[PDB]
Design a protein around this motif. Structure first.
Motif: not given
Ligand code: CA
Ligand code: WW7
Lengths: 89, 17
Positions: A65, A67-69, A71, A76
């Motif tokens: 990941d 984006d670092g969500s 999730t 994504e």
């Molecule tokens: Ca993400």
């Protein structure tokens, strides 16, 4: 100005692009969010042939990941994954 | 996708059709 990954996604064929959703739908059977929340992810390892802890699954998301969500959603999954595909070429 | 794309084969089992 992230066209270098966006343009790459078009390289995907209709079969690839359409089926892109297919497997994605396994994770999001009842996910209103439309993303994989690691809990559903444990199936992903099973596809390969592995059933490691959800927390261990989350690390797979954590590394993957960008984006670092913590999730992984369809967008994504669709575009972030292209980050690997681009690999300076 | 990222690799060989195990996801294409990942469906393995299905219902409805
Ligand atoms: Ca993400
Ligand atoms: N197992 C990594 C190396 C092989 C990758 C291709 C085959 N496996 S895969 O593409 O289904 C896959 C593997 C690991 C994490 C994933 C996340 Cl977080 C989202 C969507 C798919 C993922």
């Amino acid at each position: 100005m992230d066209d270098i990954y966006k343009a790459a996604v078009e390289q995907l064929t209709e079969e690839q692009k359409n089926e892109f959703k297919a497997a994605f739908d396994i994770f999001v059977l009842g996910a209103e969010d439309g993303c994989i929340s690691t809990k559903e992810l444990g199936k992903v390892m099973r596809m390969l042939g592995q059933n490691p802890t959800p927390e261990e699954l989350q690390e797979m998301i954590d590394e993957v990941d960008e984006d670092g969500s913590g999730t992984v959603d369809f967008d994504e999954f669709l575009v972030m994954m292209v980050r690997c595909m681009k690999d300076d070429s | 996708r990222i690799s060989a794309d195990a996801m294409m084969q990942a469906l393995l089992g299905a219902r409805a059709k």
